[PDB]
Amino acid sequence: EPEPQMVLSPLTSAAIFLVVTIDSGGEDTVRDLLSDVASLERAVGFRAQPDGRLSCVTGIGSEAWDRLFSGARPAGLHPFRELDGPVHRAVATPGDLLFHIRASRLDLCFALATEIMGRLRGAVTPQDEVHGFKYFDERDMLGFVDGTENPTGAAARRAVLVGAEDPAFAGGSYAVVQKYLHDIDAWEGLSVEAQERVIGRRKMTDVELSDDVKPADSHVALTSVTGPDGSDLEILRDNMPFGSVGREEFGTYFIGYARTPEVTETMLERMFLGTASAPHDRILDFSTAVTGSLFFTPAADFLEDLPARP
Template identity: 70%
Template sequence: MAEPQAVISRPAGATVFLVATVTPGHEDTVRGLLEDVSGLRRSVSFRAPDGELGCVVGIGSAAWDRLFSGPRPQELHPFVELAGRRHRAPSTPGDLLFHLRARRTDLCFELARLIMERLDGAVTVVDEVHGFKYFDERDLLGFVDGTENPEGQEAVDAVLVGAEDPAFAGGSYVIVQKYLHDLRTWNALPSEEQERVIGRTKLANTELPDDVKPADSHVALNTVTDEDGDERKIVRENMPFGSPGGNEFGTFFIGYARTPEVTEQMLRNMFLGDGRAPHDRILDFSTAITGCLFHVPAAGFLDDLPAAPGEREADEPAADLPAAGGERAPADGSLGIGSLKGART
């Protein structure tokens, strides 16, 4: 399997999420940045090797065919909007995702600055979120986030594309959503009621027993199983963000998976219900305002991109080109100098 990007990582202390659209006619600039992004990351992380700076790059469906020739990832498609009876998951623009994370904010900031400097005029940033670690890996609702992430080989199997799409083995899919929280209403709930909304205890971070956990709790609706009853997992790298002066408090959801279908099923359960519950009750306090789906190619794909649309691959033989006057050049590679063809006698 090709070497993956760093989609499986321990929780970060700081993150920057950049979602951008590509300006028509500037695809070559974007391709140049994609091939150099690993070098930019190394140039920043070399100055602080203990900072664990990482950068994951995702590419959206609408941009893929503008940037690359050849095959597409089999399951890459636009984010599917969901409209439930009370809540909606919107689909919003996004051609590129840059997920920057580190133990320190300055490293994420510097790499984001260098990336945007290279992309100046070539993209429009449609969403920029600076996330931070909140106490012991909690979100702004006060609950530990990411507890059920798989580990070790289980995480690899859950996140990385394998033999089902060999051209993109080692890649992954990622869905991102930006949620804003109504903290005033949330904090007015007693802790016991908050626990029923989430499906876990707030202090000890343990899952509520099945006979106590409500069917519309977040945990209940986000537990997805296959036909054999085995739970299907994703890796969440969610981060809280906020602006107290602007009264904005939220969670940036980011879920990596081997197939987007797993995360999409979770979202269908949340917004459309699953027959037992009309929707995830957490949505009564958290509103999704963005939604994008990206493919995260293997690291080697970015270091050596396939040809751009309309370009020949490097090892593809060139077709005979017409010579001056509209005639095709001789197959022997000469320019036809000294040829008697067409000469007067």
């Protein structure tokens, strides 16, 4: 009986990512928005349903949580753990609140972000805002199909949603975000055969590389992680391309939901710190991370009925 937010969304061609920090003494204005946000989603979204598919997933940062809520905390909620790799850095940037707004059209996402930020105006300071558009064939900014091996339906739920491990917050999830910028000129200089050695899948056909062709330092290889037993651990990603052409900004907005942050964090360490037979993820030779933050996205039940302020 707890309802989670729309962490498992259908395919949606548009998205707006909003990350803000809570000003001095903006705690109260925020908690009012947190209650209404579900209702607000419904207002912007209900006409233009069922095509629209407008949703919002709201996330709360580690430190912001303590300023906002009394009572117990989510089990594994900390601030984003910065990774200072030998070559590549996973930076950690400020964010107190996350709004993951998605729809089938960008104007719906825009209308709902306007409502959210309108009532938050004066209590929060914008940190990041990016509008994402999906390609007509699910490909990302590097030209590869993006999202293929995402857990689906029932296993997705089990991989993403808090359960009996933290009963107090079952139905919530942990969201990790990173805004990446690509060296498109560099990447496109590569042969397609060389690019597939980077990702770990065939570009066009989207078939994964056989176990002994797939390089140890390819993306798909490093992001496959298993548990201490004979079973593999997965996350839910909804990557969204973005960019400004004039500024030569070509991006991938990464977002990854998981039952516990330790899964996503493992994958991050393998990509940036590398393993024994892999100095790092080759995707990083073409992708530079300019922000990263960690949030708990609660059950929608938690937002309707908040705890008293600490």
